[PDB]
Amino acid sequence: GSHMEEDPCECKSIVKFQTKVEELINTLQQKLEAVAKRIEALENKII
């Protein structure tokens, strides 16, 4: 349930979700830089 009068334009609700996209995006570049580390692992036997 949520109120229906406060929060005019999410002055902090839109930037609040932004921070969630800040840590989430970082986690994506994390599993990505690790995926490239596993690919080289296979290049050690596929080279």
Place this chain on the structure above:
Amino acid sequence: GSHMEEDPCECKSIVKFQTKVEELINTLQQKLEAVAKRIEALENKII
């Protein structure tokens, strides 16, 4: 072409683009969790 008077501070245009970053980011973590599934596929023959 876009109007030049309405939309004061994108009260919904900035949060509207945010939702696009919500599904787009999810798709990134999707091709990422699948990339790790393909890496293990190679680990089955590189192990």
Place this chain on the structure above:
Amino acid sequence: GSHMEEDPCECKSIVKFQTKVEELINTLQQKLEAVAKRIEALENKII
């Protein structure tokens, strides 16, 4: 150090950071579409 009166609700500071998430997210899907290209490279010897 930052002022403590200007910038009411980041009318352009929240959307300004959004653009940073626009190019960053693209870079994530970039290393991702390249990671899948390296995975197939291993599938050429693991197939």
